Design a protein around this ligand. Structure first.
Ligand SMILES: [Mg+2]
Ligand SMILES: [Mg+2]
Ligand SMILES: [Mg+2]
Ligand SMILES: [Mg+2]
Ligand SMILES: [Mg+2]
Lengths: 157, 187, 103, 147
RNA sequence: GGCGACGUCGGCUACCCACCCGACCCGUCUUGAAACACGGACCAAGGAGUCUAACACGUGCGCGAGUCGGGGGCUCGCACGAAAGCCGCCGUGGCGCAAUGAAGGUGAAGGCCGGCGCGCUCGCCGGCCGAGGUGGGAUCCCGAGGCCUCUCCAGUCCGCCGAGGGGCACCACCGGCCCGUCUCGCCCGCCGCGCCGGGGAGGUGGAGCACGAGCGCACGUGUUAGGACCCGAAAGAUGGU
RNA sequence: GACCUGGGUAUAGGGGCGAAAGACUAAUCGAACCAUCUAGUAGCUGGUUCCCUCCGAAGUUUCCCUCAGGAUAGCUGGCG
RNA sequence: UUUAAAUGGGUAAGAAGCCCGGCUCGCUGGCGUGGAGCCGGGGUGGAAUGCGAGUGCCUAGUGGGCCACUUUUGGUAAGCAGAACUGGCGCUGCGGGAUGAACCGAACGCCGGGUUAAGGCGCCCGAUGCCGACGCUCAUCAGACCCCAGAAAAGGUGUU
RNA sequence: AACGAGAUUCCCACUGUCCCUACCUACUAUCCAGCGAAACCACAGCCAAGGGAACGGGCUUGGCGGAAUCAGCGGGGAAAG
RNA sequence: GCAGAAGGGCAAAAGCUCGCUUGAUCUUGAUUUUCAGUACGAAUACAGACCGUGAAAGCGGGGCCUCACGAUCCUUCUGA
RNA sequence: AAUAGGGAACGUGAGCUGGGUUUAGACCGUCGUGAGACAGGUUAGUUUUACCCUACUGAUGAUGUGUUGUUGCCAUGGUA
């Protein structure tokens, strides 16, 4: 019916984007992945060996195995009525470091150095974040001039 | 109308035993009085185990009880089990521990008493320690049943280890295809 | 026709088994019948011992059972030779005789 | 107990607990183990793997008496004799080790299972394992063979 | 606080009637039936999930590393007694207590200490215990501290208690053990020196071990084989008129 | 007149007889009638008997000589 | 197809974390290197809202569906054929749409008082029996309330 | 050639087949004395339109709606078998 | 241009020419794809061997990737 | 005068007829090895029931006027 073949709906996503073809740059290979690193999957098109599947392109998993040319990644995959932790072996060119935790690893750094910064000074800094509050009762100035009158323009073709 | 629930909202525990044993009903009337009146959680755990099935109240061998009471600190407390105490043949000597159970067996209660021990019921447990103070309550291995090793994923599933229902263990009884790499596949 | 996890069974009922059924309703009445046949025989041979002759010592054949001792059929015709009693006089005095037995 | 079963409570309900649409008839999917390769195949794998095919050698006329040996492992080795004599030998007179023949208890081969107590024994059996011969020599015992 | 007799007071159902409002004939297959879909003129009686065998799980009971006389036997000849009771060197046997390999066959205990062989990735002796360890874990133990009509002197009690400890069952993980195979390697033993026996170290296959939970009996549910919830073919065969 | 007809007699069921229509064989014939195997089989139609309380679907997945049927996962209830 | 939304998909928002010191390794190897494991130790307030959760066994029925916005394929079209998302009908009464499977409101234990939703208020028929406001419109085929149950191009010195 | 209870076309003769129907006769039907069934039947029985399983008798909105019956009749009951 | 259908990919190249070769070999598991998360087929990351090639880093267990195929029983050959 | 076009379950078979179509006999042509096939041709081929309910058509009568009779009026329906 609808051709259950690997690399099927990937006319555009296993394609190098535009005017970035050629042999791949070398800092991609000089990336260091350890166990528990949070990596995100993006299959390229130049390297043919370790592309995961189109099910995982765009998703983000965790490293449990490090090999000579690849990395074992456990990702969550949505099958019909449940998710499953699938462990997929992906070569090193199709992954990169996900920055998705690195705004949390900055504010565990600047939180604990600021926690003891008030412990030595005796204050109540309240380092837990709040979402965007309603605006402060401010006081606008209209110094000298007048608010400009605008009116809806007529219709023309 | 109010919400869109699936109506769980009927808790499916037990509020009284299905057993019509009148001696066991007197223990419940002893301990559901104690559970609502003494502010101890010992008498809530003992009271909910008197409700439980014969399957959920497994037996406890006499060698786990002396293995789980030779721990540091347990030397002069009481062994409590809502369930039976069968003996181990495997054990050679028995200490002088103080126990308490529904129904110790005949050979096990001969061996505790030779060694200087003392068997109690839940009646004279309640008069000695009403709060449950100075007790080590134990349980038998409730997944020790042969029923639980047929439970799992499915025998043909890969990495299953699930023991299929065969009418006779032996050659020619569920060993050919789906069990070895030659005859078709191995699961 | 099957269902989830259960046995795979071969019931041997594919034959006209309802004409060949055996009901043990007479089995009380045959136990008191064969008691009376023991009692009415025990007084017919009145001085003689009930359950008849003396039987020999016999070791059971197999690897499973050769540790145990069983009553036999009769004496081998060389015991009666060595014990010194005739083989046609042995069974009339109360001794079971088995002529096909080797020691 | 006809009173206690489901058919006295299902009485008044039209289709007796079987459905309007499927309307349970006689034998919808065959009789017995029919279709174990065709339309009941997904049943026979995942619950009966191995059901189809030869796997071994044929042995005509086996007897379940030549291949007979019951086995005791060493935890149940001192329950073959009295309780009076596991404690009789232990109270330090001499090296008088009691006999334990398993063959009058109904066993042939002696297997291994640890924690044998430190008393010397002699044990009469027809067969041994190489663990059981050296758990006994570990407590200064002897492994005497019988036939 | 007031009012009312020999025909009046109160009352309701399978009573009858009247009015307002609402209201199509049920069963059935079906996406949908009031249907121009089928069955139904009316009434009484009959009328359809049963038993038996096997298996699974749940529950109750008895005993429990065991368990069960079901087959026999015993008792004086008793209606009820085609019962009940008993046996025990009648437990033969069944199921469980050990798995595993096609088979030959083999066949489940480790940790701490001290010593020395090149403490040499390899090891050996002895003692001490003895079913490992990690993370959660009901319950229990200890608990600084705290809690009452006048301040210093002391003991049961009680409740609050930060923290600490031992951790049941179970779950996840690591380690070990047994059987089959695979690679790698050296050593040991002699009912007799071999196209012998035994051991090691790694990885794997198993329905395994890692201080046992089964058995018998009853009931409920589910499935199966039997006429199998009830009724229904066109047929096929055997022997006859 | 290859005529009409009585009684007697012969042929019998996968057989008979047929100036042929698959006609006729006891109101039955493209295989009689009786009894038995037999309560044969049906994934197909019809029916399936008391009350109240609580929970409450699916018509989709994968395989099948599969397409009016099953097995399997989902959905449900019951027990904990 | 260079560019490229909205809607959408994954992940993170802590003690299973952060840090320090030490021991193991037969892996790695200029290196007391690298990395894994292991032991001991140090300090918990780490988005908003809501909610008690976890897990196991047994398991019936079902496996013909249909509809409506929105997005879509085949088709001249269809109360047609086939998909996507959500709701509903089937399984579901009630108020309204006169009528009704699916529209619109709202879901239902048995009743009294109150108030509304959608829709309405000449009379059938509850409620405008208001001294309702401003305009438009004359039909010899007037018009008249989602789905929805009848119309187009073109034209009129008919009137605004 | 002869012969067809065979199929067909024309012509003569003849006629109610037709124009186009009419009248008479018997036996009924019809009424009475006697005797007397059966098929069939959810409940039943006046319509127009609307909606609806798209062609209602019942339902909605209208039209309207007097007992009890007799001889006929073939539209309907998607009439019966 | 890459054997052929398309799409993706590729320039001191995955294309052209040349020099060597047989890794298109032996063996155990895991993972992915379809999926019930069963099998086949195809594939990925390893590991232990024995090898090729290159100065070496290395690369290589069939074809630049997406297809090119097949249970039980039976038969045949090979293996200790 | 004109010989307009349609509808009413392609109005109308318990109203008819049975020519056609559309069973079973037979013939011919083509097709098929054959049994047989062919909106290809030809020929011969059982057309059941109303006494029910309504509708329609006629026939008595019913309600009301105290009873009963004669003479009348026209609501409404048909209409040539
Ligand atoms: Mg019901
Ligand atoms: Mg049911
Ligand atoms: Mg069914
Ligand atoms: Mg109906
Ligand atoms: Mg809306």
């Amino acid at each position: 019916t609808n051709t259950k073949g690997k690399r099927r709906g990937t006319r555009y996503m296993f394609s190098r984007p535009f005017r970035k073809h050629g042999v791949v740059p070398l800092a991609t290979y000089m990336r260091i992945y350890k166990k528990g690193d949070i990596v995100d999957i993006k299959g390229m098109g130049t390297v043919q060996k370790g592309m995961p599947h189109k099910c995982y392109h765009g998703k983000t998993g965790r490293v449990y195995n490090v090999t000579q040319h690849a990395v074992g990644i456990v990702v969550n995959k949505q099958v019909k009525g449940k998710i499953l932790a699938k462990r997929i072996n992906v070569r090193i060119e199709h992954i990169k470091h996900s920055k998705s935790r690195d705004s949390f690893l900055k504010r565990v750094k600047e939180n604990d150095q600021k926690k003891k910064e008030a412990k030595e000074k005796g204050t109540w800094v309240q380092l837990k974040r709040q979402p965007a509050p309603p605006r402060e009762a401010h006081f606008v100035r209209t110094n000298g001039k007048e608010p400009e009158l605008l009116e809806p323009i007529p219709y023309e073709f | 109308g109010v919400d869109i629930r699936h109506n769980k909202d009927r808790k499916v525990r037990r509020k009284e035993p299905k057993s019509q044993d009148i001696y066991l009903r007197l223990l419940v009337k002893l301990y559901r009085f104690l559970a609502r009146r003494t502010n101890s959680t010992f008498n809530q755990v003992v009271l909910k185990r008197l409700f439980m099935s014969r399957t959920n109240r497994p037996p406890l061998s006499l060698s786990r009880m002396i293995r789980k009471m030779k721990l540091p600190g347990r030397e002069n407390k009481t062994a409590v089990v809502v369930g039976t105490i069968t003996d181990d043949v495997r054990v050679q000597e028995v200490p002088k521990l103080k126990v308490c159970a529904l129904r110790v067996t005949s050979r096990a209660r001969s061996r505790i008493l030779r060694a200087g021990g003392k068997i109690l019921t839940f009646d004279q447990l309640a008069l000695d320690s009403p709060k449950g103070c100075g007790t080590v309550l134990l349980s038998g291995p409730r997944k020790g049943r042969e029923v639980y090793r047929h439970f799992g994923k499915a025998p043909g599933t890969p990495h299953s280890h699930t023991k299929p229902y065969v009418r006779s263990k032996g050659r020619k009884f569920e060993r050919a295809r789906g069990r070895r790499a030659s005859r078709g596949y191995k699961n | 026709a099957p269902s989830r996890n259960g046995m795979v069974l071969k019931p041997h009922f594919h034959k006209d088994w309802q004409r060949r059924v055996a009901t043990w309703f007479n089995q009380p009445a045959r136990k008191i019948r064969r008691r009376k046949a023991r009692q009415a025989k025990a007084r017919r041979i009145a001085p003689r011992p009930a359950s008849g002759p003396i039987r020999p010592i016999v070791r059971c054949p197999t690897v499973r059972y050769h540790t145990k001792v069983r009553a036999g059929r009769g004496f081998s015709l060389e015991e009666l030779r060595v014990a010194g009693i005739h083989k046609k006089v042995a069974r009339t005095i109360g001794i079971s005789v088995d002529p096909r037995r080797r020691n | 107990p006809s009173r206690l079963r489901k058919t006295r409570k299902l009485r008044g309900h039209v289709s007796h607990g079987h459905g309007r649409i499927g309307k349970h008839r006689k034998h919808p999917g065959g009789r017995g183990n029919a279709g174990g390769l065709h339309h009941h195949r997904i049943n026979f794998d995942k619950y009966h793997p191995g059901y189809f095919g030869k796997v071994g050698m044929k042995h005509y006329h086996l007897k379940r008496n030549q291949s007979f040996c019951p086995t005791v492992n060493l935890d149940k080795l001192w329950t073959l004799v009295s309780e009076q004599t596991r404690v009789n030998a232990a109270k330090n007179k001499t090296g008088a080790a009691p006999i334990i023949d398993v063959v009058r208890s109904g066993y042939y081969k002696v297997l291994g299972k640890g924690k044998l107590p430190k008393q010397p024994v002699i044990v009469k059996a027809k067969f041994f394992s190489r663990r059981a011969e050296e758990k006994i020599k570990s407590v200064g015992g002897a492994c005497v063979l019988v036939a």
